[PDB]
Each structure stands twice: as structure tokens, then as C-alpha cells.
Design a protein around this ligand. Structure first.
Ligand SMILES: [Mg+2]
Ligand SMILES: [Mg+2]
Ligand SMILES: [Mg+2]
Ligand SMILES: [Mg+2]
Ligand SMILES: [Mg+2]
Ligand SMILES: [Mg+2]
Ligand SMILES: [Mg+2]
Ligand SMILES: [Mg+2]
Ligand SMILES: [Mg+2]
Ligand SMILES: [Mg+2]
Ligand SMILES: [Mg+2]
Ligand SMILES: [Mg+2]
Ligand SMILES: [Mg+2]
Ligand SMILES: [Mg+2]
Ligand SMILES: [Mg+2]
Ligand SMILES: [Mg+2]
Ligand SMILES: [Mg+2]
Ligand SMILES: [Mg+2]
Ligand SMILES: [Mg+2]
Ligand SMILES: [Mg+2]
Ligand SMILES: [Mg+2]
Ligand SMILES: [Mg+2]
Ligand SMILES: [Mg+2]
Ligand SMILES: [Mg+2]
Ligand SMILES: [Mg+2]
Ligand SMILES: [Mg+2]
Ligand SMILES: [Mg+2]
Ligand SMILES: [Mg+2]
Ligand SMILES: [Mg+2]
Ligand SMILES: [Mg+2]
Ligand SMILES: [Mg+2]
Ligand SMILES: [Mg+2]
Lengths: 106, 67, 96, 227
RNA sequence: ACGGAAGGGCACCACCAGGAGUGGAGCCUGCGGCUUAAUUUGACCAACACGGGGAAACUCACCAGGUCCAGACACAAUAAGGAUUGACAGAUUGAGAGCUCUUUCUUGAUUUUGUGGGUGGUGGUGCAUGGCCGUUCUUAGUUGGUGGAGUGAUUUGUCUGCUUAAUUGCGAUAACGAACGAGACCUUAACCUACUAAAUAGGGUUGCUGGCACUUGCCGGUUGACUCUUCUUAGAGGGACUAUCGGUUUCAAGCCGAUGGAAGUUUGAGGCAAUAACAGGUCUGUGAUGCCCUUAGACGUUCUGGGCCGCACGCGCGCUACACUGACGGAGCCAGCGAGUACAACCUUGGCCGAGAGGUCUGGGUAAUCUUGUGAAACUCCGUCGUGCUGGGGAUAGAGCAUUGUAAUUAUUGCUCUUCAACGAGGAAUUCCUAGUAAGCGCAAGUCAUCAGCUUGCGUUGAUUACGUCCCUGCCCUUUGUACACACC
């Protein structure tokens, strides 16, 4: 008796791209397989996590710096979909690196 | 300062020596041929290879050449 | 170290009961966590036991990893005078 | 647990650094190679790739268990929510960490420096590697410092091919007169390097053309018409 | 290796033509010297706004003092009629320190005093070491296998030429095949009316409204609906390869020009970046570390206060200025990098107070959602000033109001009123830089409880003059000479 739509939301994170895109594509394919209405894998600006650091551990040497960084890609998805199939989708197809989070928002 | 170092020249030479009947005068057709008949990893190297292949083909069309 | 015997008793009983400790290197802190006593003599008592040859220590990123060897188990069992058929939580076969 | 997502990823990275350095400290005698941290909806699986898997597990599977316990206290986890897993290295020759630790161990037993280094290089190229290199720096049988290089095959140095194929390892060895520094570099076979490109950037492969016969001039080979 | 020897090529850490400067002034900061109890220390192109070194406590390493053992373990030794521990109150102390004493009370084998040993050390040695980074060297340079020449150290391959940013190629050849470097490669910046899509981004139509017009239209508001992805995003891809053409080239590598392009400097900018080496720096980043030193009134650790900021003086990065292309008033109103609270208290809107700093009450934001369209400065328009060290310049001081802070004096910092100094475009000399570049202008992030005149990034306005050379300073290859090899110091 879970016919009430939860208008659920699936958001993602990672420091990589191919695995995150793969997980999103599998999520969309699973949603399409059971006739689910959705808003697509909307892309979010890749947040560049940057730290500048001096290379010399002792200050001696010509002034030389470096910039380490990652990017975080988010690609949230929301579904106007039934209950059990959505949750089963969330607990399946999980890849290390990409982090899945689910918000009911009902 | 474009000199087209060893790799592109040698690859184009082998491309001509093994596939002259299929190569043409046009850059784009030879680019597609380079894509399909040879596994160039990147695409900038692919474009350079196709360009030098076209240049060598034009030189051959003008006349016979060394090497 | 001068540890009052009841705090040392707590150290020993927790250590034998479950076998492992972390004991942040930061001294002078009020209470060590899941022990309700000062971290300082926790570290010192574990150092004394290691010097005896009962606890293997491993320092990495200030967290003083501690583990009990078999002679340590025997010594703790004799000190805590507990029956000789109970093993620390590590020995429990919590396998796959 | 609510925290900024960028900070959460930074914490995940520093936690992986935590685990890797702690396992390097502990399982060094085990020929430790690497650690993978997989996160499931319920369990935080921690796969340990090491050489002596059976000793890593220990008798009756107790050692792994106690190791697990330490983690549950190092990060304030909960029982069952985290679980270790020991796995044999796919090929101990290719991994730089295992070779560096093994030849550090061989140095610890007073084995000849040149002999150990050359044996390591020989084994690495026996494993199928496309090139190995070892730098041993320090007080090699002299008070003055000196660095010995033992290389075989070819090792690239520029471009992410440095990151993609050749893997490096740095270790310190304590002796009775000082510290020796060990750098080990291996350029794996690009054709066998899965999960990425399978060749160098300038590696060009040309498909050999197929040979055919042209003489058939008229050759109107009629098929059965269909409608 | 060097040559005030030759050949051929390069470099705004070289110059020519220039631009902006510094060096003159005041100040901030970093060194030296002096001074001091200490003014802790390491660096002297490749030291000097460097050690992330913007230190009031901590930091800390120095100084005057006061605590404690955080001396494991083994043995001996005392010792359960006390090995020992701790303390109210007073003297003592800076202390509400049982540190030391007066008295006494408490505590139970953990300890106490000796031996061995072990730890701790921002103690010494970077001329014992690792790791890292810097430099030689941003140049194009290295290397070994067979083969040739040498008795040999070595040499040829690695070169007569031309070309390239390139040991980049065309080639000639006792050289043939190869390896590292360069290139290739990744990140980033462009171009995508082609694909996928979007209430955490925008747009259209239409609602429901506001106003002005009265013609159906203009500028708005609404998280009401339908629809779309051009811009904003980010994935897969496309695109440029010197493409076409014309010159010039043993007609080959390649160069020059025009056209089409978005892009024709390797498309711009970077990230990695070879062999060999320095007695280059770092023990002061490391629980990296050998040796030496110390390890009890300690060079361990902690507490209080002071210093790292003193000042007859010299030097190095910079900041504000010397004004009219300006200062000061109003008004216009334009960004892109960021960042932001949990076991803590961050970014702050909005409403009230105060003249301001600021204060208070609420509300958002764990982030394309909220600060935020960061409504930033330079800039623009209209006025006051009018060549007067003047309304420039804002240093040095006096008084007061607040904020952070356990604590602000030796002014932390912000704000209000006043005194307003030197400074007239700065000698010798010297620094950086050829296109969204220099320069001007600010903002964000790292330091951060509070503090930048610093650095790392970002964007605004945006040029003059080259598009060359070996004259100065050097670099690469070749030839030559050398009585040099710790190599012209
Ligand atoms: Mg290469
Ligand atoms: Mg490269
Ligand atoms: Mg100069
Ligand atoms: Mg000049
Ligand atoms: Mg100036
Ligand atoms: Mg001056
Ligand atoms: Mg001066
Ligand atoms: Mg001084
Ligand atoms: Mg230089
Ligand atoms: Mg200060
Ligand atoms: Mg102090
Ligand atoms: Mg201090
Ligand atoms: Mg003192
Ligand atoms: Mg120390
Ligand atoms: Mg040195
Ligand atoms: Mg180099
Ligand atoms: Mg020979
Ligand atoms: Mg030679
Ligand atoms: Mg579009
Ligand atoms: Mg032509
Ligand atoms: Mg480039
Ligand atoms: Mg030391
Ligand atoms: Mg000290
Ligand atoms: Mg100072
Ligand atoms: Mg400087
Ligand atoms: Mg004025
Ligand atoms: Mg903006
Ligand atoms: Mg005046
Ligand atoms: Mg600074
Ligand atoms: Mg030039
Ligand atoms: Mg001589
Ligand atoms: Mg002389």
C-alpha cells in the first residue's frame, strides 16, 4: 500500500568521472525500465578543491609553488516514482569512489 | 616551429607504403582512413598524421619521391 | 608511573575484556575514551606492559595502537583472576 | 553526521591516508601492498592486498579481527558496520610497494646491496614488466654518501604515462651507521594495463591490409529476386 | 674547463626601440651592525614579505625565575609496628604552587635510593645520512648493444650543410639498429544555435497583479500553469592538421604572405620534465635518522613574566605619495576566482539602535539554493577647489568611543576630532616586461580568536615600442690553443 509517490531525490558525488557517469546511467536505465518519470542527471559545476603549497620544506631555494586539486561532480537526480523499486535501485549498483545519497523530500 | 617529429613521419610513410590505393588527396577522407586503419591513441597525433600523409600523397602525385 | 590501583584495575579489565586500545598521544587530557580515566597513565601502563612483553605497540599518527599477545592474555587472566576459559573479544570467531 | 560535502570527501581522503600509513606500519613484515576502502549502504569494507595473506589473517582468523577492532576505535565506528578483508596480490612482482619492502627486508639481513638490487630487478622483469629501476642512496660501505642506480629496460619520465604506467615506491632502511633511501620504479606493460589506455601516446599500430584478387571483370552474380 | 681565439645559432633572469619602475622622501617588513638578561636561530644569481617566520600568551627554539617525571624494565635495597602519596590553615612565594617549612592528618606496594639500561630533547654535526626541494639548465642535452679506428685513456654512431623552440627533421655517411630527454601526453582558455538534459540556471507564451499610456503597448511583481535549452552548466563527441592558394627552398625538410576560419607564435598558459653533479638548503617538518652531548636544581615537560619589534647607522622586497590625465563632494553601478558552523559555535541577509567602528533581535546556508548578481575599486556624469607644499601628501602625536582576546602597556585592530612632518618626478647604478602582455585598480583564498602594506589566485580599464642582434651579461654545438683538472676565483 505504498502507492504514494515520495518525489524522491538521488544525488551523487565523486572525485572521478567515468564511474560516477556509469552509476548515473545505470540509475537512469533502471528508472526507465520500470516506467519512471524523472528529471535527468542534471550536471552541477565541478567544484575545484585547490590548495597552493610551497615545495621547499625549508624555505631555501627559488620561490616555487604548486597547486594540488580535485574536482567534485554532483549530478543530482530526482524521481516522481513509486516506493520499493526506487529504494531497491538505491541499494544496488554502488561503485567505490562515487558516493550515493538519497533524500525522500516527501 | 612545426617540424613533425619521428612518429608522425614514420607512421605516414608506413601508411602510404601499405595503403596507397585507399588514400586520397583530401585531408578529411584520409583522416577517417587513419582512424579506421590505424589505432592512433590521441586525436591531435591523428590529425598530424593525416596531414603529413596528405602532404606526402600530394608530393607523390606531383612525381616520384625518395624514401 | 604512580597509578592508583583501581584505575589500573579498570585499564586491565577493559584491555583483557576486549584486547585493543588507541590512547591518543596527547597527554594531560582529562579522560581517555571508553575508560573514564586519565589518558596519561593509560599510555604509561601500556608502555610498562609492553616493556614486560605483553602488549605489542604501534605508533602511527599519534594513536598508540595497542594489541595483546598470548602471554599478555595469560598475565591479564592471572591478574584479573578470571576463569581460564574466557578469551578477549579478538579471539571470538567473528568471521565472514 | 552532517558536514560539507567537499569537507566530507577531504575527510574520506585523509581517512584513506590514515588506513594506508597504519597498515604500512603494521603489515610491513607481511609484504603489504595496498588497501582499498569500499563503502556500502551498511558496511565499510576494507580490502587488504598483501603477500602473506594467510599470516595476515592469522591463526583462527584472530589477527584480522583485532585489526578490525583498532579501526573501529580509530574512527569511532560500530561493530558490524566495518569489516576487513585480506586478499593476495595479483602479481607481487609488478607492485612497487611489495618489492621495496622485500628488498628492504633483504637489506636488513645484511645481504649484499648490489646482489639484492639486481635480484629485485631480475624478478621484476621476470614478472613481465617493461622496465625496472632502483636507486639506493646512502652510506654504501663508505662514510661519504653515494647513490647507486640499477636499471634495466626503459623508464619514461615525462607526461602522465609517468602516472599511468610506471609506479614508484620510496622506503627508508635503518642500519648501524645511518639511513639508506630506496626508490623503486617499474613501468608496467601498457598492453596489460587495464582500466585506461593500452599503449603509449606515440605508439602507432597499423593494420596489415588484406590481399584480394581483381581479375573478375564481368562477374554479374545474380541472386534470387524477392518481392 | 677556460680564452679580452675563430665559425654557426639562441635568451627582455641580455641588449637595441621603449613602457613601468627601484635607488631620492615617509612608512611596513626582512637582513647586517650596535645594544641587551635575552634582543633564539638557518640561508649572505641560487640569503634577505624566505623557513608559509602577519610570534602580545601558546607558538618557542632565547632570558629571570617556579613546578613535575611523562626515569619503562631487570636486580639489589629498604619496607606493611609504613616503601610511600597527598593536604586545610598559616610563614614562603607572583600565585588560591603542600613548590619549601610550622605543626599534624590522609594514602596504601603503584612506588622511594643505588646499578644496569631505556626514553625525552626546535641539543650539535645537512662536511655522516634519507626524503624533498633549489641550482648547474629552460637550455637540448645524454646513454649503452654488435660493428670500425686507436696499445691506450677515448673515439665513430652523437656529423659537411640547410631547417627547427628542440640530437626537430631533410639528408650525407663506419656506421646499423635502439633507449631516456624534446615532441607526443594531461589540466586549463577559447568555438560548438549539432546531441543529452535542468525548480540548486536561464528564456518564451499565458495566468494572477502594479504603474504609465490609452490601441492592441511599454517597465515591473508571482515558487500559479504549459513549453524550450540560445546564453549558464557538464558528459559523450566534433574542431586544426599550417587547410587552400601564391611565393621561396640540393625543390626535400621546411620558411613567408594572403584567404577561409574561432583558433595559423607548438593556438595561448601551464603540469610532469633526461645523464651527471653541488660537500648548494633543511637534524628547525617528520615517532626519518647514524654518531656525539644531556638525561634530575635536565638542553625533557609545564607555569609566570620579558624578548624575538630595542636604535648613533647601511642594504634588499614593497606600500603611500609628490597632484589638474588631479583631490574632494554627491549621482551612475560592472566581474571572476573562492570560502563558509558538530560536537561547534563559521558566511551572514533582513528588521531595529549608534554618527562610525559596532551592538541587538530574528531568518537562511553543511552550499549553482543562503551571504551573493559578493550593487568591489579604478571608471563614468555633474559641481567645489585653482599651481598656493594648497582642499596634495598623511607620517609623527594628543584625547575619546568599540571589537577579538585569560590577558592589548611596548599604542592588537577598527572608528571620531586635531597637529598636520619629509616629499618639487629623485646621482651613480639597477630591476621586470613584446598582447588581454606590462601598468593602474581592487576582490577572494592561505596565515586568522583579532591583525596585513605579504603571498597564491581571480577578474576590471588596458597601452608605447619591438617581431631584431650578439654590443654588455650569459647559454648550445663545432674548430683551435693551453704550462689549467681543487679546472682562469
Ligand atoms: Mg619520451
Ligand atoms: Mg613533454
Ligand atoms: Mg641583470
Ligand atoms: Mg633599454
Ligand atoms: Mg612605484
Ligand atoms: Mg626608497
Ligand atoms: Mg635607502
Ligand atoms: Mg635581531
Ligand atoms: Mg639561473
Ligand atoms: Mg603580530
Ligand atoms: Mg612561556
Ligand atoms: Mg613566547
Ligand atoms: Mg625558566
Ligand atoms: Mg623534538
Ligand atoms: Mg648538503
Ligand atoms: Mg634537467
Ligand atoms: Mg667497441
Ligand atoms: Mg661522442
Ligand atoms: Mg547550448
Ligand atoms: Mg607551397
Ligand atoms: Mg606549450
Ligand atoms: Mg635531535
Ligand atoms: Mg624544550
Ligand atoms: Mg624577526
Ligand atoms: Mg623576494
Ligand atoms: Mg587630501
Ligand atoms: Mg559575480
Ligand atoms: Mg595640507
Ligand atoms: Mg609572510
Ligand atoms: Mg626574440
Ligand atoms: Mg696538474
Ligand atoms: Mg688571474
Amino acid at each position: 500500500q505504498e502507492v504514494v509517490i515520495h518525489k524522491i531525490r538521488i544525488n551523487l558525488t565523486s572525485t572521478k568521472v567515468k564511474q560516477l557517469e556509469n552509476v548515473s546511467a545505470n540509475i537512469i536505465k533502471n528508472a526507465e525500465t520500470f516506467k519512471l518519470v524523472k528529471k535527468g542527471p542534471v550536471r552541477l559545476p565541478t567544484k575545484v578543491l585547490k590548495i597552493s603549497t610551497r615545495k621547499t620544506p625549508n624555505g631555501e631555494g627559488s620561490k616555487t609553488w604548486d597547486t594540488y586539486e580535485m574536482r567534485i561532480h554532483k549530478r543530482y537526480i530526482d524521481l516522481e516514482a513509486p516506493a520499493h523499486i526506487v529504494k531497491r535501485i538505491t541499494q544496488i549498483t554502488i561503485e567505490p569512489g562515487v558516493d550515493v545519497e538519497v533524500i525522500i523530500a516527501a | 616551429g612545426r617540424v613533425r617529429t619521428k612518429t608522425v613521419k614514420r607512421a605516414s610513410k608506413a601508411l602510404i607504403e601499405k595503403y596507397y590505393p585507399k588514400l586520397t588527396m583530401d585531408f578529411q577522407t584520409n583522416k577517417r582512413l587513419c582512424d579506421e586503419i590505424a589505432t592512433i591513441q590521441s586525436k591531435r597525433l591523428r590529425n598530424k598524421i593525416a596531414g603529413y600523409t596528405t602532404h606526402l600523397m600530394k608530393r607523390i602525385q606531383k612525381g616520384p619521391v625518395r624514401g | 608511573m604512580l597509578i592508583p590501583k583501581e584505575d589500573r584495575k579498570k585499564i586491565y579489565q577493559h584491555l583483557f575484556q576486549e584486547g585493543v586500545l588507541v590512547a591518543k598521544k596527547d597527554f594531560n587530557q582529562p579522560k581517555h575514551e571508553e575508560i573514564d580515566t586519565k589518558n596519561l597513565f593509560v599510555i604509561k601502563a601500556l608502555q610498562s606492559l609492553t616493556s614486560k612483553g605483553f602488549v605489542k605497540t604501534q605508533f602511527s599518527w599519534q594513536y598508540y595502537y595497542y594489541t595483546l599477545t598470548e602471554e599478555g592474555v595469560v598475565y591479564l587472566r592471572e591478574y584479573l583472576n578470571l576463569p581460564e576459559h574466557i578469551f578477549p573479544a579478538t579471539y571470538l570467531a567473528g568471521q565472514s | 553526521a552532517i558536514i560539507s560535502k567537499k569537507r566530507k570527501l577531504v575527510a574520506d581522503g585523509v581517512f584513506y591516508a590514515e588506513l594506508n600509513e597504519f597498515f604500512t606500519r603494521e603489515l610491513a613484515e607481511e609484504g603489504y601492498s595496498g588497501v582499498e576502502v569500499r563503502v556500502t549502504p551498511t558496511k565499510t569494507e576494507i580490502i587488504i592486498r598483501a603477500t602473506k595473506v594467510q599470516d595476515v589473517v592469522g591463526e583462527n582468523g584472530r589477527r584480522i579481527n583485532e585489526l578490525t577492532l583498532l579501526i573501529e576505535k580509530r574512527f569511532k565506528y560500530k561493530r558490524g558496520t566495518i569489516a576487513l578483508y585480506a586478499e593476495r596480490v595479483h602479481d607481487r612482482g609488478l607492485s612497487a610497494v611489495a618489492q621495496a619492502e622485500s628488498m628492504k627486508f633483504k637489506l636488513l639481513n645484511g645481504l649484499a646491496i648490489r646482489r639484492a638490487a639486481y635480484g629485485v630487478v631480475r624478478y621484476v622483469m621476470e614478472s613481465g614488466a617493461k622496465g625496472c629501476e632502483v636507486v639506493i642512496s646512502g652510506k654504501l660501505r663508505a662514510a661519504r654518501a653515494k647513490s647507486m642506480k640499477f636499471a634495466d629496460g626503459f623508464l619514461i619520465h615525462s607526461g602522465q604515462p609517468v602516472n599511468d604506467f610506471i609506479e614508484t615506491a620510496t622506503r627508508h632502511v635503518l642500519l648501524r651507521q645511518g639511513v639508506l633511501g630506496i626508490k623503486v620504479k617499474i613501468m608496467k606493460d601498457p598492453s596489460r594495463n587495464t582500466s585506461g589506455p593500452k599503449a603509449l601516446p606515440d605508439a602507432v599500430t597499423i593494420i596489415e591490409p588484406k590481399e584480394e584478387e581483381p581479375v573478375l571483370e564481368p562477374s554479374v552474380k545474380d541472386y534470387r529476386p524477392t518481392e
